[PDB]
Amino acid sequence: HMEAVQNRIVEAAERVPGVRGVIHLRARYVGQDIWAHMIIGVDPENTVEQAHEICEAVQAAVCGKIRRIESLHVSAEARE
Amino acid sequence: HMEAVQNRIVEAAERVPGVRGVIHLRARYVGQDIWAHMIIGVDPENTVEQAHEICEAVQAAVCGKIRRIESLHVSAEARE
Ligand SMILES: [Cu+2]
Ligand SMILES: [Cu+2]
Ligand code: NA
Ligand code: NA
């Protein structure tokens, strides 16, 4: 069941403007719910505020598309 | 499990240009796979060919977003 969900999470995150791939995704079931931590790539010349905005947009996109996610943390790293 | 999938099918179909709602959706599991029949609404002033094109686009959209669907038939009815 988990691989199909992880595929949906990556696909959803990579559709958000400013995401330069999903660098890392760790998802685990807590019961029927998913809790996940994500690192996305961003343009190194983005501001820290812009990177924060992208992470928030990823959280909204992924949580809106995948109903079973009850916790999602998104961080950013420079990617070239 | 099925209600979440049916919600995804309707949401995916209603995002296609030319769809005037999902009129009917009957989904059933065959094993782990979903087989489904859908009726979408279309503009009565569309041509039959245009309606056929919309149905084909719905099939592509839904099957592309919901990996477990192994059979999907889409028909159209005039909706006002
Ligand atoms: Cu903020
Ligand atoms: Cu044709
Ligand atoms: Na900004
Ligand atoms: Na046409």
Residue A52 belongs to domain with CATH number: 3.30.70.1350
CA angle at A23 for the pair A18 and A24, rounded to the nearest 5°:
125
Asked if A14 and A7 count as a contact pair (C-beta separation under 8 A), the reply is: no
Q: Closest partner residue to B67 among A4, A67, A68, by Cβ?
A: A4
Say whether B26 sits in a helix, a strand or coil: strand
Domain count, chain B: 1
Strands A22-30 vs A33-42: parallel, antiparallel or unpaired:
antiparallel
Distance (angstroms) between ligand 2 centre and the Cα of B52 equals: 6
User: Distance, in angstroms, between A36 CA and closest chain B CA?
Assistant: 20
Cα–Cα distance, B68 to A25 (Å, whole number): 23
Q: Which residues contact B70 (CB under 8 A, 6 or more apart)?
A: B30, B33, B34, B35
Distance (angstroms) between ligand 3 centre and the Cα of A54 equals: 9
In units of Å, what resolution does this entry have? 1.5
Q: Which residues contact A47 (CB under 8 A, 6 or more apart)?
A: none
Instruction: Output phi, psi for A13, to 5 deg.
Output: -65, -40
Nearest CA in chain B to A4: B67
Whose tokens are 């595929």? That residue is A7
Cα–Cα distance, A13 to A25 (Å, whole number): 11
Give B34-58 as a 3 state SS string. EEEEEEEEECCCCCHHHHHHHHHHH
Q: Closest partner residue to B4 among A4, A7, A67, by Cβ?
A: A67
Distance (angstroms) between ligand 2 centre and the Cα of B49 equals: 7
Domain that holds residue B22: 1-78
Chain breaks after residues in chain A, where C lies over 2.5 Å from next N: none
Torsion angle in degrees (nearest 10) through CA of A47, A50, A55, A56 = 150
Cα–Cα distance, B69 to A15 (Å, whole number): 22
Give chain A as a 3 state SS string. CHHHHHHHHHHHHHCCCCCCCEEEEEEEEECCEEEEEEEEEECCCCCHHHHHHHHHHHHHHHHHHCCCEEEEEEEEEECC
* Ligand with smallest separation from the Cα of A50: 3
Using alpha carbons, select from A5, A3, A1 the residue that is nearest to residue A67: A5
Whose tokens are 């501001």? That residue is A47
| B22 strand-pairing partners | B40
The coordinates were experimentally obtained by: X-ray
Task: Convert A20-46 to b/e letters by CB count within 10 Å (16 or more is b).
Answer: bebeebebeeeeeebebebbbbbeeeb
Instruction: Output phi, psi for B11, to 5 deg.
Output: -55, -45
* Ligand with smallest separation from the Cα of B50: 4
